Design a protein around this ligand. Structure first.
Ligand code: CLF
Ligand SMILES: [Mg+2]
Ligand SMILES: [Mg+2]
Lengths: 113, 465, 473
């Protein structure tokens, strides 16, 4: 069901990934957007973006997640392109909520590194 | 042309320090007291690094707390960190009785009023714990003078002043006070046996025997000093004080003489045969008790063992020694008894004006047939540099932070003094007394024997010696 | 929920530092306070800011004088305490330097004492031309300007290069502040002050690995097999001058995001070098990390050849240990990052259940990571202290504790074995082989005849002395 699928993706990211836990708000936002846009491409058979060094790194992170999602979750090979996109938009929102909006990490907005 | 010369290190900086700073030595004094947790007033490293150092030497945990000086205290003063730290200790450790409050470079520079904080805490503790007495001893240990040797002596003196101030003079105990200095548990075990065999009652300050604690079926933790408040208070009532270490507790023996008329007898630290002989003669003098046959026998067994080694393996071999001043001077005398030649003695702190007056210097000047260089204010680079410039040594005696000098120079090395973390069980092996002299001589020989085998240097000779 | 331990009834502020993860909780409501002031008198495990700069990071370098401007204790205390070998005979571990500050320097200043010490150090070791100078508590308090002294020395001695760190032990609350001051000063002053030859199409820095028991040298066998040039290691088996070249890398691979994330973040800001966080401990983690690096460079096939070979070599041993370690309970009481690098890797690869974790100096960031990866029913402790450790042992009854040696020697009395979570027992512990080494030490620690023998009271008529049968992979 759509909420179960999203719960699967969210639990995977939380227990596996590090890119959502970078040092500052702006870096978390950049990574959530960048990695998950690539994940969507990879899970829907689209050509990944591999132009700039940053794009190539989002691809690298995304490839791990896309491969793990396809191995862990049978549904991820059954749902269609629009359903994958909708799930990943929901996942972006959830990740922003828990890693930025409602995080009590008091360093996230410090202007200097 | 036969010359014992004292000279200072010729560099302003240090490379490879021989000793730690004063607060580390104060901590060492305190951990030998039962129901004591020292409180080190300064930054956190001043505590944690020293707890690690004790774990390296003893392979045990000892409890020491920090006041956790942070940036606000550096601007406005740290008294509130002391006061909080004392109460947090008292509240969480109901059996705690003694807190030496040890200053550091930071808290000496900023001038926190330790005695004023102690008055605050004494009032607070008396109100909060009416049926408890906690002894707070102020220990002034700036790290920019002296060393852990001086810090040890200062802490012992302060704790004794604090506790004896509180209890004063009572009924004569008939006991000796004994300040062995900074020695291992094995040295304490040997001294207890000597006093038992001589039928002399004595308190050894501090009694660190149980630092070598068992792993017990009941999971009990026994890794504590055995010297109690009551033991320290009773020092006022002793027959006499025997101080074995000029730089490591004699000033407490003098304080007890000045304050309580307990006569202090300072003797050479009992490394080697003669120094042990003279210690036992002083004990006999002050107590009226005879030296027992059992100690004549232990002495004879030590001499028998050393006689298998001295002219065969030791004669004319050149030795460098580093460590605490009482240990260095005492081991130089031991070396001579067994025909070793201690040509380089390194003492690691700024106390040269005292060392120039040490009567053992003169005892060396009147006996050595080879030149001796005594470098004070020395670091361990002073040893390495001399070896690199051509000094030929057959043996090094010192603590484990000199290990790489010996390893790289391919010189055998016996681990003595503090800390000896790179060999197993040395804290349990006496170095003082007759059995200690024997154990030291046999470590020396066995280190030489292994070296002969690894280097193929007449290794076939180890058959019919 | 947050936990008020019985031993903290008189310091109840500690409850906001201790989380027991329970079913269905929103963990965002239960993040420990971290990186706050220490409570005096607690027997906190924390060290000082100077430690974080000199012992942890700067002192790892193989070719650099470590000039500690202060009294001799800070130097003594950071010597013979670390296990970071080099390929030049362990220069870094053999030596420590102090300005031997005395009372007269407190009164009149220490700058000339420092200057003289610095020239002496370069004179005594004429092959060494690089130095880091650190302040300590009292040299900070008296205001010695070590940067100005270093400037004069470099003017007077044009063949040396000197870096300075202001890191008195009272700064910050822990080692962490030392990490930060060193990282930011290095990127501001010394990065892009020279360049090296580029010999590969694929270049990276490895950031936040300090070569404990040879970890860095083990990982370097991977990079060499893959044909990746490492411009600089920050700082395992590293050189001062390699660190000056960091701007040249195409990619920054980060392991210790706590100590060294700062310089990765600034290298991205200033030079556009992307930051890739990995876990270089953990068997399946190491495979993920290699796959990410190889996907970034477009050398995927070379990555799969290396992974296949490493699995063939090491996975059977790893699985032997998993069979015997499955269900064992572990505690991790270390600095912070190893909590989140290890909790799920020991669970996945060894079947080990981490039941309690304590961080000396971690930030809220580190707690986000560990709680995300960690189990329900586990305790998560910020700035733990000794009495808390005993209470936690009574609550969770670990089979093994990964912690420092002193704490290991304490818990031995309770018949609990330890592995040195800082300096390792028989490392390295990073990489594929390293995780097998970790598993071996855990196995030999717990399945140890001495532990069983200690429990027997020979006076109990009813008791015999057992024999245990062990194994080897
Ligand atoms: S918290 Fe850290 S280790 Fe402590 S002093 Fe400060 S920088 Fe240094 Fe140094 S000399 Fe000894 S150990 Fe201290 S009392 Fe000073
Ligand atoms: Mg989860
Ligand atoms: Mg015989």
């Amino acid at each position: 069901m759509s909420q179960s699928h999203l719960d699967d993706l969210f639990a995977y990211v939380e227990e596996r990934c590090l890119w959502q836990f970078f040092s500052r708000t702006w870096d978390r936002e950049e990574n959530i957007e960048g990695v998950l846009n690539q994940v969507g491409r990879l899970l829907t058979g689209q050509e990944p973006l591999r132009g700039t060094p940053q794009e190539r790194l989002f691809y690298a992170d995304a490839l791990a997640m896309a491969n793990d999602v396809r191995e862990r979750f049978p549904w991820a090979s059954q749902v269609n392109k629009e359903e994958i996109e909708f799930l990943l938009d929901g996942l972006k929102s959830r990740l922003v909520d828990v890693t930025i909006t409602r995080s009590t990490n008091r360093e996230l907005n410090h202007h200097l590194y | 042309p036969a010359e014992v010369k004292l000279s200072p290190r010729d560099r302003e900086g240090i490379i490879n320090p021989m000793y730690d700073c004063q607060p580390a030595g104060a901590q060492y004094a305190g951990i030998g007291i039962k129901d004591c947790i020292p409180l080190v007033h300064g930054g956190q490293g001043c505590t944690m690094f020293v707890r690690l150092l004790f774990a390296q030497h003893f392979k045990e945990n000892f409890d020491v707390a920090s006041t956790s000086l942070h940036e606000e205290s550096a601007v406005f003063g740290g008294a509130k960190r002391v006061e909080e730290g004392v109460l947090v200790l008292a509240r969480r450790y109901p059996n705690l009785r003694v807190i030496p409050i040890i200053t550091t470079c930071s808290t000496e520079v900023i001038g926190d009023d330790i005695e004023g904080s102690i008055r605050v805490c004494n009032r607070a503790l008396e109100a909060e714990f009416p049926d408890r007495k906690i002894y707070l001893a102020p220990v002034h240990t700036p790290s920019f003078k002296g060393s852990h040797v001086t810090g040890y002596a200062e802490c012992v003196k302060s704790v004794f002043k604090t506790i004896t101030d509180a209890h004063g003079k009572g009924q004569p105990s008939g006991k000796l006070n004994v300040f062995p200095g900074w020695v291992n548990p094995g040295d304490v075990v040997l001294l207890k046996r000597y006093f038992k065999e001589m039928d002399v009652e004595a308190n050894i300050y501090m009694d660190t025997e149980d630092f070598d604690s068992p792993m017990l079926p009941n999971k009990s933790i026994e890794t504590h000093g055995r010297t109690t408040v009551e033991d320290i208070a009773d020092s006022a009532n002793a027959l006499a004080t025997l101080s074995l270490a000029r730089y490591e507790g004699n000033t407490t023996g003098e304080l007890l003489q000045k304050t309580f008329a307990v006569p202090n007898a300072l003797v050479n630290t009992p490394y080697g045969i003669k120094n042990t002989d003279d210690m036992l003669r002083k004990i006999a003098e002050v107590t009226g008790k005879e030296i027992p046959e059992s100690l004549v026998r232990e002495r004879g067994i030590a001499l028998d063992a050393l006689a298998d080694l001295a002219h065969m393996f030791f004669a004319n071999k050149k030795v460098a020694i580093f460590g605490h001043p009482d240990l260095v001077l005492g081991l130089a005398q031991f070396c001579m008894e067994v025909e070793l030649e201690p040509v380089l003695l390194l003492i690691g702190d700024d106390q040269g004006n005292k060392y120039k007056k040490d009567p053992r210097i003169e005892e060396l000047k009147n006996t050595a047939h080879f030149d001796i260089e005594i470098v004070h204010n020395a670091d361990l680079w002073e040893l390495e540099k001399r070896i690199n410039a051509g000094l030929q040594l057959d043996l090094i005696m010192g603590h484990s932070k000199g290990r790489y000098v010996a390893i790289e120079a391919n010189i055998p090395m016996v681990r003595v003094g503090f800390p000896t973390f790179d060999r197993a069980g040395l804290y349990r092996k006496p170095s003082i007394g007759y059995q200690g002299a024997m154990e030291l001589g046999e470590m020396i020989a066995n280190a030489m024997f292994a070296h002969m085998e690894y280097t193929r240097n007449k290794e076939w000779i180890l058959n019919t010696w | 929920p947050m936990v008020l331990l019985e031993c903290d009834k008189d310091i109840p502020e500690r409850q906001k530092h201790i989380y027991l993860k329970a079913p269905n909780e929103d963990t965002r409501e239960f993040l420990p306070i971290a990186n706050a002031a220490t409570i005096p008198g607690t027997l906190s495990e924390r060290g000082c800011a100077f430690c974080g700069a000199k012992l942890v990071i700067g002192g790892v370098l193989k070719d650099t004088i470590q000039m500690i401007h202060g009294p001799l204790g800070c130097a003594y205390d950071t010597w013979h305490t670390k296990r970071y070998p080099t390929d030049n005979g362990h220069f870094n571990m053999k030596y420590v330097w102090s300005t031997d500050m005395k009372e007269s320097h407190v009164v009149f200043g220490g700058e000339k004492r420092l200057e003289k010490s610095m020239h002496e150090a370069f004179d005594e070791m004429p092959d060494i031309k690089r130095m880091i100078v650190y302040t300590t508590c009292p040299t900070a308090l008296i205001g010695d300007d070590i940067k100005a002294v270093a400037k004069k020395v470099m003017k007077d001695r044009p063949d040396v290069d000197v870096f300075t760190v202001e890191c008195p032990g009272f700064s910050g609350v822990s080692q962490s502040k030392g990490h930060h001051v060193l990282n930011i000063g290095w990127i501001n002053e010394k990065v892009e002050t020279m360049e090296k030859e580029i010999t590969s199409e694929y270049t990276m820095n490895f950031i936040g690995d300090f070569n404990i028991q040879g970890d860095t040298q083990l990982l370097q066998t991977y990079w060499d097999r893959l044909g990746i040039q490492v411009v600089a290691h920050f700082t395992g088996n590293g050189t001062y001058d390699d660190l000056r070249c960091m701007h040249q890398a195409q990619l920054n691979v980060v392991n210790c995001a706590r100590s060294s994330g700062y310089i990765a973040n600034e290298l991205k800001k200033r030079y556009g070098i992307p930051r890739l966080d990995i876990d270089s401990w953990g068997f399946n983690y190491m495979a993920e990390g290699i796959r990410k690096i190889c996907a970034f460079f477009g050398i995927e096939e070379k990555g799969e050849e290396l992974i296949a070979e490493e699995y063939a070599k090491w996975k059977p041993k790893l699985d032997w240990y998993k069979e015997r370690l499955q269900g064992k309970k572990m505690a991790i009481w270390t600095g912070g990052p190893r909590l989140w690098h290890w909790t799920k890797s020991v669970e996945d690869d060894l079947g080990v259940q981490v039941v309690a974790m304590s961080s000396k100096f971690g930030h809220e960031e580190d707690f986000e990571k560990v709680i995300a990866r960690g189990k329900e029913g586990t305790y998560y402790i910020d700035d733990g202290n000794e009495l808390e450790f005993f209470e936690i042992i009574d609550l969770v009854k670990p089979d093994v504790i990964f912690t420092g040696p002193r704490v290991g020697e304490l818990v031995k009395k309770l018949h609990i074995p330890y592995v040195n979570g800082h300096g390792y027992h028989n490392g390295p512990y990073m990489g594929f082989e390293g995780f097998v080494n970790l598993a071996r030490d855990m196995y030999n620690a717990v399945h140890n005849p001495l532990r069983h023998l200690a429990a027997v009271d020979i006076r109990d008529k009813s008791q015999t002395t057992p024999v245990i049968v062990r194994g080897a992979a």
